[PDB]
């Protein structure tokens, strides 16, 4: 349900009587993708400063996504309207709050987060993969900025960022839970007061096949990731890309089902225990995406074997995927979509992301209908178009001596 | 007349080939003088103009070679 208030801001809510808890949040787009190297991380810092305000009993948290930012005030159902007002206040006084703020403490917090994403091997690998894939464009920048750039941010920078991006045309109030939509809309309208402005032009980005290798021989595993130019939220292949990713699905060697998971790659890598774990994903940004896998290999001598087998299984995508695999992938993608949309916090984040970045959100039933329309031939056409023989972007962290340089993995993308 | 003899005649008259022809002819004269003495048969070193002849013929060949087969 949608209602465009005065100021032109849109309130989008997905109310469900069965919701355990309610959530309402203001999101104003312009994540890291809107920043540049010198002032990178300013969006995350501003959102953290706003989210650090008095919560009046609610749970105020920052979002800090790649392309959009926002503050979400989780709260029980009956309190939702209050939370509404809260965030409205927090955003009608955003410039005042930033001005009166001593950014020191918030900057050590953001630097701690930036170090965290540079220590968690998967976070580091995926951040490096995104940076190298879209190198040269703002989309390459970290969501939370780097430790070198965070410390160089000042209040005036955050004020300029808010003035540019915290405008009615670039902001959305998303909500979910069990409440009357009209009550929340009325409560926010009386309290929301933000500057006028045009929606900032979203910066361009183009995929560039590349390889980045942070080899740290002191780590205990090899955390690699390989991906191709995926499908953005706008592309009609979005769900088709998710189905293609789920065809290969996840795998954890020590999990009980490791010996029974359907995907062929799982059966292949367990013969010599090539890999410890992997997960296929289709990350989707506003207009471009990254479709691939992340993997952790325990045996440093089998990174090449895993890459070879995974890329061969990708080659299967354009030739030999059976109706069984396509049906399994469809069912698993539908279940994953429904799982991702259970928590009211997740529903609010999803509503904000879609409404800001594509303008319209497909209901879950519409998404199910769109996925069920996929046939095996559609998946193979997508594999031919986007996976078969397309440039790949690679990343690795530790014990990657066995990760053969680009040309080997790239040539694996087209050998039968 | 065959082209080769006329080419040799033209080349030996060239300025580059002139000094070699000169040296060769006074070598011939000197060797004939050496042959005039009655003691020639006893001389251990009986001179000959082989070297001057070779120099002359090399300097004439270097001229005739590139042009001859244009005549045939």
């Amino acid at each position: 349900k949608y209602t465009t208030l005065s100021n032109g801001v849109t309130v989008a809510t997905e109310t469900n009587p069965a919701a355990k808890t309610s959530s309402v949040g203001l999101f104003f787009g312009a994540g890291s993708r809107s920043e540049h190297s010198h002032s990178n991380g300013i969006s995350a810092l501003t959102t953290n400063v706003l989210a650090s305000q008095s919560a009046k009993g609610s749970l105020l948290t920052a979002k800090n996504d790649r392309e959009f930012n926002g503050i979400i005030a989780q709260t029980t159902n009956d309190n939702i309207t209050e939370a509404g007002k809260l965030i409205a206040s927090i955003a009608s006084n955003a410039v005042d709050i930033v001005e009166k703020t001593d950014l020191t403490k918030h900057k050590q917090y953001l630097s701690a987060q930036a170090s965290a994403v540079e220590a968690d091997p998967k976070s580091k690998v995926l951040s490096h993969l995104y940076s190298s894939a879209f190198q040269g464009y703002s989309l390459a920048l970290p969501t939370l900025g780097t430790t070198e750039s965070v410390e160089n941010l000042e209040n005036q920078d955050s004020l300029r960022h808010l003035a540019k991006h915290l405008v009615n045309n670039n902001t959305v109030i998303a909500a979910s839970g069990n409440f009357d939509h009209d009550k929340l809309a009325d409560a926010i309208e009386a309290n929301l007061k933000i500057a006028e402005g045009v929606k900032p032009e979203i910066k361009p980005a183009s995929f560039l096949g590349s390889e980045v290798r942070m080899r740290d021989d002191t780590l205990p595993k090899a955390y690699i990731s390989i991906a191709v130019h995926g499908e953005g939220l706008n592309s009609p292949n979005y769900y088709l890309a998710k189905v293609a990713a789920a065809i290969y699905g996840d795998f954890y060697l020590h999990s009980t089902i490791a010996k029974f998971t359907s995907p062929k790659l799982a059966s292949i890598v367990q013969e010599y225990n090539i890999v410890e774990s992997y997960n296929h994903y289709s990350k989707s940004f506003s207009d471009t995406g990254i479709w691939g896998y992340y993997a952790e290999i325990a045996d440093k001598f089998t990174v090449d074997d895993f890459t070879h087998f995974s890329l061969k299984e990708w080659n299967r995508l354009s030739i030999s995927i059976s109706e069984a695999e396509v049906a399994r992938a469809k069912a698993q993608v539908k279940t994953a979509l429904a799982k991702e949309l259970a928590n009211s916090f997740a529903v609010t984040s999803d509503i904000a992301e879609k409404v800001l970045l594509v303008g319209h959100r497909q209901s879950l039933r519409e998404a199910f209908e769109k996925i069920d329309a996929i046939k095996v031939n559609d998946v193979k056409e997508w594999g031919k178009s986007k996976v078969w023989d397309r440039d790949i972007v690679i990343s690795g962290t530790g014990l990657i001596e066995d990760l053969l340089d680009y040309n080997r993995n790239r040539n694996e993308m087209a050998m039968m | 007349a065959d082209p080769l003899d006329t080419l040799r005649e033209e080349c030996t008259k060239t300025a580059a080939c002139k000094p070699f022809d000169h040296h060769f002819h006074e070598c011939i004269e000197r060797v004939t003088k050496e042959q005039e003495e009655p003691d020639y048969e006893h001389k251990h070193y009986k001179e000959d103009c082989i070297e001057e002849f070779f120099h002359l013929q090399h300097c004439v060949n270097d001229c005739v070679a590139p042009r001859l087969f244009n005549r045939l």
Binding site: - | D2, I50, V64, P66, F69
Partner: protein
């Protein structure tokens, strides 16, 4: 050694068949074979050439066959054991004028005129040498040199004394195509024919060479391009070292 011992170095005449893409002047091969049979067959064998080798090179098969019948060859003796002889055929090799080296040495003051089927690949100057040898005789030997009896002076011959003596003289042969028979023309023709006899694969060899160069040069350029292309990722690597 002395310049005389090594023999005057023959110059480089621009033969029609020197360049990488020129064949023998098969007109010259035929004329050279004529000069051979007319002059050189008196002394020189040229055994390794069979009449069949001439078909399609300097003589049509009918001419080679006819030239074969004009000679006699030893056949398997009759069933009665008596010697028998047959007219020559294409498969037969050209016969030399002497039955054995002993006869050749006897008939040439002890000098042995070498078989000419390899004389071009068995001499330093190759074709040029032969030419320079046949027209290198000076009317007057250089003053002072004394030749052993029976030897004639030729500067291009190692040692300066050759038992041959000039053979090619003006208008000694009436060419079949009306070409003038100057001594230089005859020498060029004989040298070309002997070069063919020593290198019958010359034309085929150079044609195959042209095809091989085309293929291998295109393939080498392709390999250069492919290697540079597949090495662009490595030559474009950029490192960073950022310790604390």
């Amino acid at each position: 050694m002395t310049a005389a011992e090594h023999g005057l170095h023959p110059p480089a005449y621009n033969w029609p068949h020197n360049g990488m893409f020129e064949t023998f002047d098969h007109a010259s091969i035929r004329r050279g074979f004529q000069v051979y049979r007319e002059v050189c067959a008196a002394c020189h064998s040229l055994d390794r050439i069979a009449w069949r080798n001439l078909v399609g090179v300097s003589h049509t098969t009918s001419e080679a066959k006819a030239m074969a019948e004009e000679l006699e060859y030893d056949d398997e003796p009759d069933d009665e054991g008596k010697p028998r002889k047959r007219p020559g055929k294409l498969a037969d090799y050209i016969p030399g004028p002497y039955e054995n080296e002993q006869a050749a040495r006897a008939a040439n003051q002890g000098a042995y005129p070498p078989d000419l089927s390899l004389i071009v690949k068995a001499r330093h100057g190759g074709s040029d040498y032969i030419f320079s040898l046949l027209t290198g005789y000076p009317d007057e030997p250089p003053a002072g040199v004394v030749l052993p009896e029976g030897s004639n002076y030729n500067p291009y011959f190692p040692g300066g004394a050759i038992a041959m003596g000039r053979v090619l003289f003006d208008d000694l042969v009436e060419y079949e195509d009306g070409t003038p028979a100057t001594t230089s023309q005859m020498a060029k023709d004989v040298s070309t024919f002997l070069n063919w006899a020593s290198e019958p694969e010359h034309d085929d060899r150079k044609k195959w060479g042209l095809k091989a160069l085309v293929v291998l040069s295109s393939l080498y350029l392709l390999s250069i391009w492919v290697k540079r292309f597949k090495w662009t990722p490595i030559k474009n690597r950029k490192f960073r070292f950022d310790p604390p």
